[PDB]
């Protein structure tokens, strides 16, 4: 996104981006899918 | 019309084949994979002596992470996984459909992110890793 | 390693001291490998047909 | 489990001309998880 | 709501919520919700997870009295919630998942459910396991 | 002992050798009936 | 090599077959004795003139809970967690061994547990009058007929319940051998089934020490020639029994447990037994670097004449 | 039409399962988490 | 070995233990052997 000067290709930066991606794919997304399956299977709003 | 003698012969052959395959694979892969996993956390180098204070150097873990981050930034970086492409217009109407189907099946149905992360992190230390797909036919 | 014998008299009193427990080392075992055949033949042949 | 050290590893010893030789380097070892886990019974007490 | 790891109990043979066979989560719920489901005539059903919490800091002590009277309906009490995949019925039946909610020597609620509402964070995950790594073990 | 493949150490406490690992030793067969001492294991 | 081998005998069927129930006091109690007798004739002459009824209400029974410490002392890598799990398994084994023993609850209080007036007045100020809490065991609650001080007597049958004549604790009498072999008779468990049916227990489980399964195994055969196996071109030699049905129609499932005393056999039932717990296993330390465990647990039994016990020996 | 015997069997099974799960999880996670939290504030090194 | 390598990938899990599932419970997990073989069994 900032390939002009912010290549971001640093060992620490990528080591951190990997863990954040892991959290996102194993965390927030599952939470949202569960909330959707929940609200979609109960209640009338 | 499968005979029981045929099944017994098959059981014997399969048992001996599994025995040979285990006897090979053990010393071929697992004898190294165990110690590799032990080095992953730095638990293999033992404290030979108390006064030594053998501070371990976690180096394998470091390279493993340095490779895994780039791996995930390559494949799992995009919101989608893959996208089929055809060579003619007579079969382009099916490309998008197959793409949507596989993406849904992989991400919106299965934890493809976790599957890929596991297949990667475990492969660089076990010399290999495997993924599998079957037809689930559950019923109440 | 092998666990210890099971006790059947655990009736300690309340608000007391933590008595020293039974702790034992882990036994270790070792082994060694083993070592050929003889290929005695003529071998003067096999160079031509 | 059968702990192997080196597969047969087809190999040669030396060469004196036509007097060819060959060697093998098979090396293995046996381990048991717990000695008091696999049972054996013999026949004794004869006579 | 957030949920610490000190109030969670899971089996060893599991690696994810999907294949998890048993999953417990102790909770601190008032006596009101319990009366809403059991023992209306009796409201005096009194009673590591505390050590790890009181050691995350050095100020709190979960096993103390903040001032709530034991008879007060709002008095918080520990209840055991569980999700189990098992054929409690005739084993010939499918391995159905069931949510159970119980108190001390008393069950309050039981129902079927096909999804665990819990989600877990796993930084530096460990394949083939339910728990990942941690910064502590690295530093 | 406090802070503790297996090397051995010994000292001299006046008139007693003190080994740390707590090694065990045994004496050979004493018999004087014109028989060998038959050294002992360990 | 980066692992350790541990036998870890952890059958523990009883603990998982009895469940558990939390309490809020170190001493719990229930009350149930029996229904009224039949009295046979109940004819009348058009007049009641009663005597305030013969209700004779229930009796109040109680039990005590004990303590298990299993201290940990540190002076494999992290051996702490390893020894902790090992001690946890050991305390579980000890619980499985105790709860099936013949212990009898012994404490300063016998039937006046309350004694709120006295309650050991000479306790505060010195705090060193600590007695030892001992809980009631299996063989003690199953309508015992005595106890050798702190252990149930293994040579005396139990009494009879007034509701219906039933002796749920009997001294085995192997009438097959001339008092030489220590084994169940062929018709000594069926007597227990009869007694239970008369008392109405509905038990369907039997725990047994592997030092006695050979008896039930051979029971499927005999010498008189009335019972014998068959093999119609079968490549199997099944030598085992896991189900019994007395002539009364009561099924009984057999299970093996190595943590039982060899000179006894038990007749369990799921609901009739419950495991009361007060303090859960907590990893902690003493007052103001050791670790320790402390588990307060007690034993509860719905009714004594429901479960059954049978001692194995020769009369003398 | 849930029987009380069924519920008692379920209670027993669940109790033993919770016992095993605790015995595992303790030494699996919490033994490390406690010392990690202690290091968080630097209170473990005495 | 299949259990040792797994329980040594970490030091928390033990696949050969009981997580609480009753053996008679239909959902009790059991080890099955799946195989793909190229052979003329016929």
Separation between Cα atoms, residue B11 and residue B95, nearest integer Å: 44
Test mutation, C4, C5, C13, C15, chain G, max G CBs within 10 A: C13
DSSP E5: S
Separation between Cα atoms, residue E120 and residue G3, nearest integer Å: 29
Residues in chain H: 46
How would you class E1 by CB atoms within 10 Å of its CB: exposed for 0-12, middle for 13-18, buried for 19 or more? exposed
The widest CA-to-CA distance across chain D, in whole angstroms, is 62
| Alpha-carbon distance values, B128 to B58, B121, C1 (Å) | 22, 10, 32
DSSP D39: -
Residues in chain C closer than 8 A to D26 (CB atoms): 35
Residue C33 has φ and ψ, to the nearest 5°, of -90, -175
- Is residue G15 within 8 A of residue G95, CB to CB? The reply is yes
Residue G128 has φ and ψ, to the nearest 5°, of -110, 20
| Alpha-carbon distance values, E36 to A42, E33, E124, G187 (Å) | 21, 5, 43, 52
How would you class G44 by CB atoms within 10 Å of its CB: exposed for 0-12, middle for 13-18, buried for 19 or more? exposed
Separation between Cα atoms, residue G273 and residue G2, nearest integer Å: 43
**E2: its two tokens:** 């957030």
Residues in chain C closer than 8 A to D24 (CB atoms): 36-37
Separation between Cα atoms, residue B53 and residue B50, nearest integer Å: 6
Residues in chain E closer than 8 A to A37 (CB atoms): 115
Test mutation, E8, E19, E20, E21, chain I, max I CBs within 10 A: E21
Test mutation, D32, D33, D38, chain G, max G CBs within 10 A: D33
Give kind and range of the element (H or E) at residue E112.
Answer: strand E106-112
| Alpha-carbon distance values, B139 to E97, E113, E114 (Å) | 13, 15, 12
Test mutation, G2, G4, G7, G8, chain D, max D CBs within 10 A: G7
Report the DSSP pairing between strands G27-31 and G60-68.
antiparallel
Contact E138 B58 (CB under 8 A): yes
- Is residue G86 within 8 A of residue C3, CB to CB? The reply is yes
| Alpha-carbon distance values, G103 to F20, G96, G142, G297 (Å) | 44, 13, 12, 14
**Residue E132: closest C-alpha in chain B:** B118
Q: Which ranges of chain B does DSSP label H, i.e. alpha helix?
A: 4-25, 31-40, 60-74, 93-103, 112-121, 123-126
Other beta carbons less than 10 A from residue B93's beta carbon = 9
Tokens 């670790």 belong to: G291
Residues in chain B: 140
I1-8 long-range contacts (CB < 8 A, ≥24 apart) are I1/B22, I1/B26, I1/B30, I1/D1, I4/B34, I4/G3, I5/B30, I5/B33, I5/B34, I5/B37, I6/E128, I7/G3, I8/B34, I8/B37, I8/B38, I8/G2, I8/G3
| Closest listed residue to residue E107, CA positions, set E17, E45, E50, E22 | E45
DSSP H41: T
| Alpha-carbon distance values, A16 to A23, B60, D44 (Å) | 11, 17, 69
Separation between Cα atoms, residue A21 and residue A2, nearest integer Å: 19
How would you class G147 by CB atoms within 10 Å of its CB: exposed for 0-12, middle for 13-18, buried for 19 or more? middle
Tokens 């071929």 belong to: B28
Separation between Cα atoms, residue G97 and residue A4, nearest integer Å: 73
How would you class E80 by CB atoms within 10 Å of its CB: exposed for 0-12, middle for 13-18, buried for 19 or more? buried
Q: How far is H40 from chain G (nearest CA, A)?
A: 19
Separation between Cα atoms, residue G72 and residue G285, nearest integer Å: 10
**E79 forms bridges with which residues in the sheet?**
E27
Interface of G with D in 282-301 (CB under 8 A): none
How would you class G175 by CB atoms within 10 Å of its CB: exposed for 0-12, middle for 13-18, buried for 19 or more? exposed
I4 in reach of chain E (CB within 8 A):
no
Other beta carbons less than 10 A from residue E34's beta carbon = 22
| Alpha-carbon distance values, G158 to G20, G86, G282 (Å) | 28, 40, 39
Other beta carbons less than 10 A from residue H14's beta carbon = 25
Following DSSP, what letter does each residue of E114-131 receive, concatenated?
Answer: SS-------SS--TTSS-
| Secondary structure of chain C in HEC code, one letter for each residue | CCCCCCCCCCCCCCCCCCCCCCCCCCCCCCCCCCCCCCCCCCCCCCCCC
- Is residue G142 within 8 A of residue G168, CB to CB? The reply is yes
G16 in reach of chain H (CB within 8 A):
yes
Tokens 């013969």 belong to: G54
Report angle CA G18, H10, G254 to the nearest 5 degrees: 55
Contacts of E77 (CB under 8 A, 6+ apart): E28, E29, E30, E31, E34, E45, E46, E47, E103
D33 in reach of chain G (CB within 8 A):
yes
Contact B41 E137 (CB under 8 A): yes
User: In chain G, after which residues does the backbone break, taking C–N over 2.5 angstroms as a break?
Assistant: 75, 288
Chains G and C touch (3+ CB pairs under 8 A): yes
Separation between Cα atoms, residue D47 and residue G225, nearest integer Å: 35
Contacts of G88 (CB under 8 A, 6+ apart): G281, G293, H23, H26, H27
- Is residue E83 within 8 A of residue E22, CB to CB? The reply is yes
Check the CA dihedral E79-E83-E85-E89 and report its sign.
Answer: positive
I26 in reach of chain B (CB within 8 A):
no
G5 in reach of chain D (CB within 8 A):
yes
Separation between Cα atoms, residue D34 and residue D1, nearest integer Å: 12
**B5: its two tokens:** 């003698």
Give kind and range of the element (H or E) at residue F12.
Answer: strand F10-12
Assign D14 to helix, strand or coil. coil
| Alpha-carbon distance values, H45 to G74, G283, H29, H35, H38 (Å) | 16, 20, 20, 10, 9
- Is residue D24 within 8 A of residue D5, CB to CB? The reply is no
Residue I32 has φ and ψ, to the nearest 5°, of -120, 155
| Secondary structure of chain G in HEC code, one letter for each residue | CCCCCCCCCCCCHHHHHHCCEECCCCEEEEECCCCCCCCCCCCCCCCCCCCCCCCCCCCEEEEEEEEECCCECCCCCCHHHHHHHHHHHHHHHHHHHHHCCCECCCCCCCCCCCCCCCCCCCCCCCCCCCCCCCCCCHHHHCCCCCCECCECCCCCCCCCCCCCCCCCEEECCCCCCCCCCCCCCCCCHHHHHHHHHHHCCCCCEEEECCCCHHHHHHHCCCCCCCCCCCCCCCCCCCCCCCEEECCCCCEEEEEECCCCCCCCEEEECCCCEEEEEEECCCCECCCCCCEECCEEEEEEECCCCCCEEEECCCCC
Residues in chain A closer than 8 A to E115 (CB atoms): 34, 37
**G233: its two tokens:** 């071109």
- Is residue G150 within 8 A of residue C11, CB to CB? The reply is no
- Is residue B72 within 8 A of residue B112, CB to CB? The reply is no
Separation between Cα atoms, residue G202 and residue I8, nearest integer Å: 47
- Cited resolution, angstroms: 4.6
Contact I17 H24 (CB under 8 A): yes
Crossing angle (nearest 10°) for helices H4-25 and G79-99: 150
Crossing angle (nearest 10°) for helices B31-40 and I2-9: 10
Q: Give the technique used to solve this structure.
A: cryo-EM
Check the CA dihedral E15-E18-E23-E26 and report its sign.
Answer: positive
Separation between Cα atoms, residue G206 and residue F30, nearest integer Å: 59
Assign H28 to helix, strand or coil. helix
- Is residue A25 within 8 A of residue E127, CB to CB? The reply is no
- Sheet harboring E9-10: ordered strands across? E9-10, E22-30, E76-85, E97-103, E106-112
**C28: its two tokens:** 């270790």
| Closest listed residue to residue G23, CA positions, set G275, G202, G246 | G275
| Closest listed residue to residue A34, CA positions, set G223, E114, B137, C11 | E114
Separation between Cα atoms, residue G30 and residue G274, nearest integer Å: 12
């Amino acid at each position: 996104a900032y390939a002009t000067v912010g290549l971001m290709m640093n060992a620490a930066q990528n080591r951190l981006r990997m863990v954040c991606r892991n959290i996102a794919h194993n965390g927030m997304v599952e939470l949202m899918r569960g909330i959707y399956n929940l609200i979609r299977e109960n209640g009338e709003v | 019309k499968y005979s029981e003698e045929v099944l017994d012969e098959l059981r014997v052959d399969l048992q001996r084949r599994f025995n040979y395959a285990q006897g090979y694979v053990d010393m071929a892969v697992k004898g190294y994979a165990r110690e590799a996993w032990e080095y992953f956390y730095g638990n293999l180098p033992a404290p030979v002596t108390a006064g030594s204070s053998s501070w371990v150097d976690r180096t394998v873990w470091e390279s493993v992470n340095g490779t895994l981050q780039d791996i995930i930034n390559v494949f799992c970086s995009g919101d989608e996984a893959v996208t089929f492409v055809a060579d003619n217009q007579q079969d382009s109407d099916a490309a998008d459909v197959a793409t949507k189907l596989v993406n849904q099946i992989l991400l919106r149905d299965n934890p493809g992110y976790n599957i890929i992360s596991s297949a990667a992190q475990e492969c660089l230390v076990t010399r290999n890793s495997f993924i599998k797909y079957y037809w689930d036919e559950q019923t109440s | 390693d092998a666990l210890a014998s099971v006790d059947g008299n655990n009736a300690h009193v309340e608000g007391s001291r933590a008595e020293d427990g039974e702790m034992k080392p882990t036994v270790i075992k070792s082994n060694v490998t083993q070592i050929r055949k003889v290929v005695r033949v003529s071998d003067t042949a096999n160079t031509t047909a | 489990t059968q702990m192997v050290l080196r597969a047969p590893k087809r190999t040669e010893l030396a060469k004196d001309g036509s007097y060819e030789k060959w060697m093998i380097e098979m090396e293995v070892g046996l381990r048991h998880r717990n000695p008091y886990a696999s049972g054996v019974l013999f026949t004794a007490a004869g006579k | 709501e957030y949920v610490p790891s000190e109030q969670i109990f899971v089996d060893e043979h599991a690696t994810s919520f999907a294949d998890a066979q048993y999953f417990c989560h102790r909770v601190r719920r008032s006596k009101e919700d319990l009366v809403a489901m059991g023992f209306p005539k009796d409201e005096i059903e009194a009673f590591q997870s505390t050590v790890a919490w009181s050691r995350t800091d050095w100020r709190q002590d979960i096993d103390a009295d903040i001032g709530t009277d034991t008879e007060d309906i709002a008095s918080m009490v520990w209840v055991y919630e569980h999700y189990i995949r098992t054929g409690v019925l005739d084993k010939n039946k499918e391995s159905k998942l069931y949510q159970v909610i119980q108190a001390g020597e008393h069950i309050l609620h039981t129902e079927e459910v096909t999804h665990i509402p819990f989600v877990t964070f796993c930084p530096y995950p460990i394949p083939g396991s339910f728990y990942g790594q941690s910064v502590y073990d690295i530093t | 002992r406090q802070h503790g493949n297996q090397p051995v150490n010994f000292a001299r406490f006046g008139s007693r050798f003190i080994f740390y690992p707590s090694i065990e030793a045994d004496t050979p067969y004493y018999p004087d009936d014109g028989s060998p001492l038959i050294p002992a294991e360990n | 090599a980066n692992w350790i081998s541990v036998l870890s005998p952890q059958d523990t069927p009883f603990v998982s077959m009895t469940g558990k129930e939390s309490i809020n006091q170190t001493i719990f109690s229930w009350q149930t004795d029996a229904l009224a007798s039949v009295d046979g004739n109940n004819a009348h002459v058009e007049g009641s003139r009663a005597e305030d009824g013969e209700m004779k209400p229930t009796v109040i029974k109680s039990n005590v809970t004990q303590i298990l410490r299993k201290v940990v002392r540190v002076s494999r890598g992290r051996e702490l967690m390893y020894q902790l799990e090992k001690k946890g398994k050991e305390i579980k084994r000890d619980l499985e061994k105790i709860l099936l023993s013949g212990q009898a609850r012994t404490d300063v209080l016998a039937d006046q547990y309350l004694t709120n007036s006295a309650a050991d007045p000479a306790v505060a100020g010195l705090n060193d009058t600590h007695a030892a809490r001992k809980t009631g065991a299996f063989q003690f609650l199953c309508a015992h007929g005595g106890l050798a001080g702190g252990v149930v007597d293994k040579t005396k049958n139990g009494p009879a319940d007034p509701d219906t004549g039933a002796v749920t604790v009997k001294v085995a009498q192997n009438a097959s051998n001339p008092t030489t072999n220590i084994g169940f008779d062929e018709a000594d468990i069926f007597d227990m089934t009869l007694q239970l049916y008369t008392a109405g227990s509905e038990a369907d489980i039997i725990m047994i020490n592997p030092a006695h399964a050979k008896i039930f195994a051979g029971l499927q055969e005999n010498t008189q020639g009335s019972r014998k196996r068959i093999f119609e071109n079968t490549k199997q030699f099944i030598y085992e029994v896991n189900s019994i049905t007395d002539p009364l129609g009561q099924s009984y499932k057999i299970i093996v447990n190595r943590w039982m005393p060899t000179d006894a056999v038990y007749f369990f039932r799921s609901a009739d037994w419950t495991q009361m717990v007060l303090r859960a296993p907590k990893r902690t330390e003493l007052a103001k670097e050791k670790w320790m465990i402390e588990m307060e647990v007690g034993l509860r039994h719905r009714n004594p004449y429901a479960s059954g016990v049978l001692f194995t020996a020769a009369g003398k």
